[PDB]
Each structure stands twice: as C-alpha cells, then as structure tokens.
Symmetry: C4
Subunit: 450 residues, 4 copies
C-alpha cells in the first residue's frame, strides 16, 4: 503493498497526476476552441492525451492501492481498499474522466477534442495535491500566491477560449466585436488568435474594457455576463491575494501594531525619551534577534506528546548543561520542558533581588548573568549558559535564616534568554523522583552556608 497517503510517495504521485490534470484543464478547452491548435499539433496532442490517460489509469490504480485509516490503522487489505475506492464518489469521477470518449474522433472527426472534456473530472487530484503542498511546503505563501495566479491564468485562458468560440459561432469578422476574420494574414495566425483572445479576456475579466463594444444581442449578453464574472471572480481571487499578503504580514503587522500602541501610550503620557529609547531598543532587539513570536502560542496547536519532542529537540542544547535535568533521573526533563516559560531580559535587568518572593527557578538558556553585590557594580559570580539560579528560595531547607527570600541579586549583563520555572511546578514535578532533589539541596546547603 500500500501507499500510505501520509508518505512522500503519495505526494510525489499527487504531483505526477496533477500534471496531466492541469494539462487537461488548460489544453482541452484551448484545442476545442482554437481549431488550428488542435489540428497543427495533433501528432503532439495525441501523444500528450494518451500519456495523460495512462497517468489517469495509474492514478486509478494508486487509488486502489492507497490505504485508509480504520481504527487509526492503515488498511492494507487489497479488496478492502478496492471497496473503499469504489464506494467513494472519487471512483465515479475517475471512471467518468477515463471514459474512452476519444472514440468519437472517428465520428466527429479529429477537430473535436472537447470529447476529452470529461478528463477534467479528475480536478480533485489536482486540488488534493495543492492542499497537500500548502501543508507540506516550506514556502506556504509563495505556493498560495502561485496557486491563485494559476487560477487567474486558467480563468483568463478559459474566457479567451470562450470568446474565440463565440466569435467562431457568430462568425469571424461578421462584426467589429467578434475576433477578426481568420483569412487575414495577421489575424489568422494561431499565435495571434490565442494571444488576442487572451488580451480580450484579460481586458474583460479585469474590467478594463478597452475592446470593441458588442454589436449583437448575444454579444451584449455575453459581455455583460463576462464583465460580471470578471468583477466577482477577480475580486474573489485578487482579494484572496490581499488576504494572503495580509497573513504574510500577520506576524510583523501584529508586532508593529503592539509597538505603535506602546509608542502612542508613551507619547501621550510624555514618557521620558530615555525610557522611550529603552522601549524602542527592546522592540528592535525582539525583531532583529527574531524573538517577536512566542513559541507557546504557536506550539499550543501541536499535540502535547509532540510539542514535548519539539521542545526537547530545541532545548536539549541547554538542558544537558544544567545539573538537574538529563543527569540524575535522565527523564525528568520531559516533566517540566512543557512548562519552562522562556523569558528575555535586557542588559542590566535585575532578575532577582535580595528579600523578594522566591517563587521561580531560572535556567540560563543564553546570556551572561551576574550574582552581584547589592551595591550594584561589584560582580561576585558570573553565571553563563547552563547555569540555574533561583532554586534555593524554592525548597524547604534546614538552617535557612532567609526563608522564601533571594539569597543574592541576579542581574543580566546583556540580553539573557532564561527558562523561568515556577515554584509550584518544580514542587509538583520533583515529587515523582527525589533522586535529583538530594543533590539539588546539596547545592542548596552548600551555597546557603557560604
């Protein structure tokens, strides 16, 4: 065997089947409308159509060999897959899109390729590929815009073909509206035919209108309907363009809107230009160093038993340098990684101060912190990455003259990325295995006596 739709093989086949479906959606109508296209390159159209039909058949086979999830397990029983396929509307659409209507080439002649129009009924495969690509691609907005542009181009191409067909029905050159006479040297070339039809279609759907006005009632009606199709469908698609660009700007726009609200508040309250500059510097840091997004709000949509792995694969850089995690229990790190709230501190920010509520443990992910003196400048100890502080005031200790108080003040030399671990959480998670707690308050007593 089976294909496992989640796999890469299924996605690759989705591409390989979208190619014929897109080809069919673009070219069947073109060949049906522009007769010279069908006739001049008939030897190539036959090859391409037969290859497309072969790929359609192989796609039907793949649909027979693609497993589905019952009880969460991939069904691998062949006949079960055949039944699941045939019971779905997709099998009906596939049989309809693979009906050998090409036999009508013997009746209607080689000049009627619209018999292959049923081949469009595999559009679903194409759309599936798109909805898969949009999910799996690393450039979701580039692909989304390319998809919208493809839809625009297909719509304009189809409307060009429709215009040319209507000109044919009315008669080429019978009036100033229809496509001019084919017998003209310049206006008889297939290139000119298609490109002028596309020009007309673009002017009509984009509602520019710089085309000869209608002459007949059918022409007036078609032009009204087509200008309305233009207005509505092009507003739809080119406003989807707008929404895609909006969601492209979503993060940056939200960040900038927050900054603007802050600046409005500061200018209204006449906040000192010192503090205004400090705030602007904080936000410039958040942007430049790519910290505007908070991983919590993003990863909250992941499963906890997958967001856990995510956090591990991101923070194993530091949670191996820490003494508590991955050293004593070697598994405890998972119990708290999904609750280590990542904070960022500016240079000179006092994370801790003597005589404060010690309700948070900190793990230094990045940055240089200092166990300073209360004078403000004298740096007693420099804590680099992997260090952990703020854990002594969490625990119950014998001989602690300072209970629930910070034993020292910790300031940040530079921008520090820390993991604030709350006291309640450390309490709750160390209950399972105190084999790490013993050396934890080993460190605790050792630092509380000195």
């Amino acid at each position: 065997v089976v294909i496992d739709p989640s796999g890469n093989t299924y996605y690759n086949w989705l591409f390989c089947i979208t190619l014929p479906v897109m080809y069919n959606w673009t070219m069947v109508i073109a060949r049906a409308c522009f007769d010279e296209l069908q006739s001049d390159y008939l030897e190539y159209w036959l090859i391409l159509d037969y290859v497309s039909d072969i790929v359609y058949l192989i796609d039907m086979f793949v649909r027979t060999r693609t497993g589905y999830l019952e009880q969460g397990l991939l069904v691998k029983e062949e006949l079960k897959l055949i039944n699941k396929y045939k019971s779905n509307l997709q099998f009906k659409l596939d049989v309809l899109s693979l009906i050998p209507t090409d036999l009508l080439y013997f009746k209607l002649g080689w000049n009627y390729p619209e018999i292959r129009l049923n081949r469009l009924l595999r559009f679903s495969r194409m759309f599936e590929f798109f909805q898969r690509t949009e999910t799996r691609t690393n450039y979701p907005n580039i692909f989304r815009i390319s998809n919208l542009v493809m839809y625009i181009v297909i719509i304009i191409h189809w409307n060009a073909c429709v215009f040319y067909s209507i000109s044919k029905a009315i008669g080429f050159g019978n009036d100033t509206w229809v496509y001019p006479d084919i017998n003209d040297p310049e206006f008889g070339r297939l290139a000119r035919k298609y490109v002028y039809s596309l020009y007309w279609s673009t002017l009509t759907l984009t509602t520019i209108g710089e085309t000869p006005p209608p002459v007949r009632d059918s022409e007036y009606v078609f032009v009204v309907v087509d200008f309305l199709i233009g207005v509505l469908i092009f507003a739809t698609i080119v406003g989807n363009i707008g929404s895609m660009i909006s969601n492209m700007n979503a993060a940056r726009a939200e960040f900038q809107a927050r900054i603007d609200a802050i600046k409005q508040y500061m200018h209204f309250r006449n906040v000192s230009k010192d503090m205004e500059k400090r705030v602007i510097k904080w936000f410039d840091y958040l942007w430049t160093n790519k910290k505007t997004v908070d991983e919590k709000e993003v990863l909250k949509y992941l499963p906890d038993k997958l967001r856990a792995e995510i956090a591990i694969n991101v923070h194993l850089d530091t949670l191996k340098k820490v003494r508590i995690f991955a050293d004593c229990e070697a598994g405890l790190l998972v119990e708290l990684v999904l609750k280590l709230q990542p904070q960022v501190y500016s240079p000179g920010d006092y994370i801790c101060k003597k005589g404060d509520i010690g309700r948070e443990m900190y793990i230094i992910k990045e940055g240089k912190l200092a166990v300073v003196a209360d004078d403000g400048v004298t740096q007693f100890v420099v804590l680099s990455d992997g260090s952990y502080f703020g854990e002594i005031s969490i625990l119950n200790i014998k001989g602690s003259k300072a209970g629930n108080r910070r034993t020292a003040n910790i300031k940040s030399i530079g921008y520090s990325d820390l993991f604030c671990l709350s006291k309640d959480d450390l309490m709750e998670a160390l209950t399972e295995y105190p084999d790490a707690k013993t050396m934890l308050e080993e460190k605790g007593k050792q630092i509380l006596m000195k």
Copy 2:
C-alpha cells in the same frame, strides 16, 4: 389554527411570497421603463400581477394567522394575532403594497405599470425568507453568494431601466449618450433595448465606462452619480463577496496559518527533519481525517441542554460499549458527556506511563491501544474501541502499592481518538450514584491484584 413561524410551513410560505416580491422588484421597474415590455406582454403581465397580488393577500392572511411568542408560548388566539399584526409596521407596509393602484390603469392608461411600484413594499418578506434560508440551508455560503449575485443583478437591472427612462425623457437618439433611436430596426427591438441598457448599466456600475460620454448637463450629472453609485455599492457588494469567500476559507485558513507558524518555528529553530516530518504528518492527518475543528469551540454556542443531546447523539456509538455508562445507572452518561475532552494520539504515542500522575480517565472512541511492557515492544493487552483505561489511578483503593501511579503503560498503535475524563470530574460526577462505582473498583481490584 396557527402557523408557528419556526415550522417548515412558514418557511415554505416565505418562499412562496418571495417569488412575487422578487418578481415585482425585478419587473415593475422594467415594464415602467421599457414600454414595449409592458405593452407586448400585457396579457401575461396582467396575469402575473394579479397572481402576485393574490399571493400578497394570502401573505397578509398568513401574517394574521402566524403565532408569536409571549411568555415563550406560541400565541394561538386569533384576535390577539390580528392585533399583533395590525400593531406592527408590517401591516402598514402590507396595506400600502396591496393598495389597488391598478385602478389608475383606467386613468394613466395601460402604459404606466409603475403604479404597481407600491408592491415593492413587501420587500421585508423576501428579506425574511433570505435570513431564514441562510440560517436553515445546508449550503450557507452558496446561498449567500447567490443572494449577493441577485442583489448585483437587481441593481444592474434597475440602473439599466433608469438609463433607458432617462434616454426616453431626453429623447431616444437626441444625442450620442442616450439610448439610440427606437425607430432603428436593430435598436428598436425590446431585446436590444433591454440588453443594451443592461450593457450600459454594467459598464457604469462596474466602472468600466466603455460607453458614449455624456452630452447634456443632466447626462453628465447622472453619469457622475451613477459611476459613484457603481464605485460605492459595487465595492460594498463585491467586498461582501470577498468576506463571504474569506469565511468560506476561515477554517482552512486558520488551520493553514497554524501550520505555517509551526513550520516557521521549526525551520527557525532548525528542528530535525524527522520531527518536522512528524509534525507535517500530524497536520496532514488532522486535515485528511477532518479533525482540524474542535467540537468544543463550535458547540459552545449551543445550549448545554441541547449540546448535551448533540454529544449524546454523536458519542452513543462508544458510550454504549463502555462498561460504566448506559449500563449501571443508564443516565450517568449525560453528567460527563459535556466534559469528555476528545484527544487524538499519533501512532506510538505513550498515553500513559508507569509512575505518572493518574489524573485522567480515557475512553477509547476509535483506535487500537496497547497495554505494553516497559521494554517498549512487548504488547501485553490490546484495547480496542469501547475500552476504558486510566481509571484505577483515579480511585481510592485498598492494597494499592501504587497510589496515584499508572499500573501500566498505554501506547497507541495507530491514530487513537480517546475521551480524556479528568480525575476531578469523575470524582464529582460519581458522587451522585455509586451503584456504578462498586463494579468500577471491582474492575480496579481485579486488575490491581493481577
């Protein structure tokens, strides 16, 4: 009896009255402006107008026979309904729209059907039908787009009629702007008249402008006003189109935006392509198997005493296979169905692990789980649908060497849809009837000894 507006009969009548109202809104102005329309098909217009008026009268009768809610009860007293009708502005509008202005046909002649313009004053019924359909239809966006297209078409039709009337007032063919001379063979046909007027209207409201420029001051003024009506009203309607397409994409766009934020985080943090593929697979599963929507956020707008029934009608498939619910008390299932949080687990995800906080009971809705050994591969027990686990570590038990600990580790073979029932909730809800609890810890002791 009375009609009970909530019923299907009332909605069917809403359709049956919207038909004449829509007919009147489309055709009265057309016949008033295009005199040949009124004259040539006068025998049909008379029949249709009289049928419309009869339906208007029957709609007034229905309004006299439609109950309203006082004290939440449907008023069935006839005279009370007559008073409620006559006291509402709707009765005034109905009498105004049913005034026999057709008598003016004897004074103004058969060439003045705008006397029936008062018939437009039942627009409310039409709109009511729409606002009912949008609520009750299964295709809300299809109907909404059809409604907007109907508004566009009606506006363009009315503007075409207005253009033709203005041409008539100025005189057909008196200058290049107005509709050409009626005496022309081609430009005198009612078909050509209406269709060219519609063409002009479309070019003006869509602001394409490929029409002969005005000549007189009245023409310049009307064209300015009409181009502005075009800009404003068509932006309104075709931007409502945009918002409707947006809300069509709302679920998919939110899902894809979450996926994009996740992928941005993973690529920025250089998350391993293993875990990136796992996350993409999780999201592909959520989409393909239609799990992107969380029933909680959707059904939270339902009444609890209706959302309860909803959850029952959805989850009675599994809550009959479970041993606790619908078996001992047979009514307890409602006390917890509105708090069974549905979770989804990937293949191989450890739902439970030995030596963890047993604070959640799980009911396997769909999927195969395994009571494995801690080695990781040896599957002791396979739990299929209807099974419940994680309930032993909830309860107070005699002789439990493992208190508040998982007696075994449960992993998911495939994608498991479970119902996580919190410990607090099971505690709170079993307090009412311990007739099920006794066999609950029957199972508890039986599994805790073996």
Copy 3:
C-alpha cells in the same frame, strides 16, 4: 456661564459651526477655480462668507466659554478658559482661519476668493462634530457612510476644481485634454463648466479614464498624479465603506458563522435530522426574538457603577415581582444584578431534575415553567414570571432529607428567559443582610415539609 462640552448645547453649536466650515471647504475652492461662480453670485457669496465669518467668531467665543476638566471638574473660571484656549493650537488655527484676508479683495479684485482659503483651517470643528455625532447618534453606520460619501464628494469636487484651474492655466481649449473653450455656447455655461469638471474628476479618481488623453507634459504628469490619487485615496475611502458594511454585518455575520460551524459539525457527524431541526429552531429563535447578542460582552465596557444602573433599568420589570429583591432589603438587588447570568431554555428543557447538584438559583424573567412530576407529563405547579426556584438546594436547612439535591424537577413550557444566580454568589451576597434570608428559608421550610 460655561458650555460644558458634554452637553447638548455644545453639540448643537458643533453643528452650527460645521455648517460654515463645510460651506467653506466646498465653495472657496469652487469660487476660486470657477470664476463665473464667484462673479455671477458674488452678492450671495459675500453674504454667505460674512455669515460664515460671524459664525467663526462666535465659535471662537464659544471656545473661550467652553469649560474643560481639571481634577475631573468643569472649569468655570473665565480667564482660566481664555488661557486654556489661547494655549492650545486650536486658538492659532482659529486666528489664522479668521484673519481678514478679504481685504485683499481691494488689491487682487473680487475675482480672487481663494484669499478665504484660510477659512478651511477650522476643519477641526467640523471633524469634532463628526466624531461627536458618530458617538451620540442612534444611526452610527448611516452617519459613517454619509460621512464617507461626503469625503468622496468633497474630494471629487476639489479635483474637478483643480482640473478646471489647470485648464485655465494651460488655456481653455488649447488642446484636447483641457476643459474646452469657454467661448463655446454649450461649454461656456457655469453649469456645464462645473458639471463636466466633476465628470472628469469622477472618471479620474474612480480610475475609469474615459476622458481625452493628455497632450502636454504638465497634463500627463497631473493625470498620472491624479490617477494615483484616485487609486490610493478612493481605495482608502471605498474600503472604509467596506469595513463599515462589515461592522454593519458584524453581529449577524458572527451569528451566522456560529450557525454554519454548528451545521458543518452536525452534517459531518451525521447528527439526526431531528436534532439538526432542533438546533436550527434554537438559532431561528435566537435571531427572530433578538437574543443573538449577550448583554454581558456588550455592557462589560460600561462602568460597573453605570452597567449596574443599566441592568436595574432593564430588569426592574421582574426583580420587583420576585419576593427577595426590592421587598426585604430594597437595596440587595444591586448586589446581585451584575451577576444574574441570563439563560434561555427551549420548550421542554429540564432546567432542574431531582437528585442533582443544586448550585444555581433561577429567577423567571419571562416564560412559563412547570414543577412537574418525574413521570414527565403531570404538571404539579406552574411558575410564571417573577417566580424564583432552585433556592432551597442552595441553603443550609434543618430537617432536609435531601441535602444539595433538587426537591423537584423544573421543565420549561415554551422558551423561558431565566436569571441563573449561582450558589456561591447568593451565599456571598446574602451575608450582608439576612433580613431577607429569614423569609427565604421560611419559604424553604414551607416547601420542604410539603
């Protein structure tokens, strides 16, 4: 005083000063550009300009006599108000807009009314009136759309005047782009002048372009700049139109989106058409009876000491029929009115059932409820409006064989609007005055014995 800007007198004056400001913003540029406008109606323009200037002077006086809030109190000291006025930029703008530039009529002649262009510098007053109207009017969206239309019209009018001025500078009729020769009988009329200039302006700003193309470099540059002004500013304004219509649809669109999510869930889960019809009926009820909006989310932006008054003025209809409120303490009703959560129940919905957690007291605002038998049909007692139930299981009672249990089952005959009062809240709020509690458990014992 003083005038007290919050008062109605200040708003009326805002209108009376917006009239000259709007007049000045519309007509000064018109008279400056269309010389015939200035000249032909000079006797009227002089009167209107002098009246506008008098009103400007009276507006300056009003600004001297309008109090401001210092320490939250309206300043009534005259000289303090004069200082507050003169210290503001508004005084500078007012003196600039009232500078007697009309004296230049003696130097530049009566054909130069753009000397009155400084009169536009009172635009602020106009805008203030708008921002006041939008706040105080009952039709905020009608006024907002009218304001946007006024901006559109003013912009188009100004661009028409600019086009005519540029034609004058280049010379009327010197090329096909500029306004045609004034000496023409038809193209020399002030009506034709202004209306064709407005036509050109509309075609340019709405970017239709059906105007003679530029000839000179200045004309090309102006047309480029004006088409870009068109694109940008008209997108701005006519997209503000879109956002205004969106916020017009905001409530209805949110309601309908909730209904659509519900229907999607129900159709996906194959919810029985019984329950689907019940849900659709619930939502039809919510809409038809105007219950889609929840007063909590709306009134949460009001002050509690004003939202309290709001809730009182709305619910004194029923909280006078209740026995506890406005009867014993006569003031207790305010302590709980801001926490009476309004619920709606469908016909047949069991609000209470025997043997359930009695943690909510209910006050029947509207609707008929029944104290039924557990059989389901036998109605023991019918509770109409003003009745209160679910209070016995809240209180501590002697001789209650049923503790924390519902003494009877309450069902809703029809759609009941109730006030669910939580047990914790009744406990917390009755602590202040048990003078009502005594008769509360009077009723309690009386019903608990029978």
Copy 4:
C-alpha cells in the same frame, strides 16, 4: 570600535545607505531604458554613481564594524565581526552589488548603464532601514503609507522604463502601440519620453487602459502580463493601504463599535433616555479625555522589568503624594505599581458605601472625591489627589466594631481617576516590609476612633 546596531548611529547610517540604494533602484533602470537620460546627464550620473559606490563600500565597512549579540553581549572583536559578516549571505550580496561592472563602459559604451544593475543587490539595507524606521518613528502609519507610495511609484517607474525599452526594441513608432517616433519634436523630448511612459505605466498598472491597443503578438502578450501585474500587485499594495488605514482606525473603530453595541442594546431594551444620555456622556468623556485605551492591554507586551519603569515614570506624579509609597520603604511602590488597576468614575458615582465588602484600596490619581454623609449631600471630607482611601477595611484592627465594612461612603465630585489596589495584593505586598504598615494602621486607628 563597533557600531551597536541598536544605536542611533546605525540607524543614521541605514538612512545614508538607503539613499544610494533607492537612487540605484530608481535611476539605473531609467538610464538603461531612456538612453537620453543616460547620455544628456552622463557627467552627473557618473558623479552620483561613484558617490553611491563609495557609500556602498562604506556600508560594507560598517557591516565589518557592526557588532552582533552572542550570549546577549555585543561582539566587539574585529576579526569575529569580519567572520560574522563574510559568513552571511549579506556579504555575498554586497560583493555582488559592488563588482566593478562599470568597466564594461569601455566595452559596451557609455550608453549601457544597466551594467550597474547589480547595485540593486543592496536592497536589503534599504528594507532594513524601513523596518527600523517603522519601529522607531513616532509616525508609524505616515511612514508606512509613504513606504507603500514609494513602492507604487517605483513599480510604475519600472514599468514605464520597461514599456519604453519594449518600444525601443520593437522600434519607436513602428505601430500605434509602442512609444511614438523619437524624431518627432514633441515626442522626442526626454521629458515627454519619460512622462508619457509613466502615463502608459499608470494606465496599465492601475488597469484604466486608456492607451492604444497592442498591434503585435509581443505587444499583446506584454500588455496582458502587465495588466495582470497591475491587477495583482496594485491590489496587493493598495489593499495594504486599506489595512494600514484600518489599523489607523483600529482604536477609534473598536471604541465606536463598543459604543454602537451599547446603543443597540439600550435602544432595544428601551433604556431610559436619562441613562442613554449618561452612557453617551461616559463614552464622550472617555474619548475627549483620551481614556479609550487601557494601558494594561497595551503595556502587557512590554517586559515586566520595563513596564515597571514605564508605570513608575507615569505614576510618580501621584505615588509621591501618597503617604505609604516612596515615604516609608521608598521601594515598595514598585511591588504594587504593576497591579494598581486604574479606574475612572463619573461625577456622583459612589466608589464606597457603608456596610460593603472592603476588598479594594483606592489611590486618587486625579479628581475630587468626598467622604460624604449617608444622607447624600453633606460632604464631611474632601479628598483631593494623592489621598488614599478604602484601606481601613483591608487591615486587621483592634477595636473595629465594623469588620470588613466601609467606615464611610466615598462619592466622586466629577470624573475621578483612581488606582484600585485589591485587598489580596496589599496583603501580599506589605508582607515584605511592615515598616510602612505600622503608620498605615496608625492612620487606621486614628480614623477608626474618630
């Protein structure tokens, strides 16, 4: 060293390098396409190009001398900065944009300035400056709109240059579509050349289309592609304009939407016009006095150890007049400034009333309050700014006949801005230092006895 990108020097250099990048992005294509531009002002183009290249070199030097943050510290080691530069793609782009392609002037002649097209590869610097300006400027929306207008102008300019180049390739005047013959006196001027090309570009990108239709297939194709570029890219940019105006209106629109929901509720519930006027007055006050924004929601994105400084720099005006803060401990004010919830009370609003739950302490930021008698009018004490009340009923006091009760009723004479400090918070924060608490209940006893 180093430059410290957060500093003002780096931003100034960002401007000084954006000037050549913008110059290059505007003029290289212009000179490449309009040959007369390159030739006539070659002496000036050479100077400007060499100055631009010198500034590019100095920008490369700056990039070598700009520190980056490792461990949150600004790297000042020269060679480390050289490595960080050369290891980034920016160094590749800078070397590519500074390659001396001007040497090709000796081969291709002075008429080929597109060899300087590589100079566009420093676009990043320009964009960086923009993203810095948008952050640091006080007019974020003005700058954003200016940036979008710059993008529009650059796109139109580039498309004008492209049109002129295509006309050159096809041949000037070979058909009606291309730019006319250069040999024409009027259509040969560089001014006319560029300005008509810009006119064509504006008509095409804004999709007005009032230009001669294409003649050749290449012209038709280019016009189709360019009209589509117009539609898509101009919708993008001029809808970004819409979103920028939306976020300009965001605060005012949210405020007005809240007011509209309130007014809809009041008119639907038939709220008395007294209370409707009171609510409208409250909202008029909120707007006029600039209180629609709540500093909590804005400043919650700031760091707590920066939002603290913000609140201090804003509220030190009053927290120096208070007796508790900045007087006894002199540091306690920071422990509670981030939890002082700012409330606003209308004139006559009873903040406190005798016999109520004293769970909030109030600090009068602005406004006159009264310790009144319960009669309602007799004002015992007038509390101005700096005063604090509601603190007696917070504390545990000996001899308090009124426990957890308000000792008096406090009403607001005028609009009072207060700081509501919750009881729990005062309890929690006074635990650290009771040196202020002693005089706190000094005041407490002193007022409780009298």
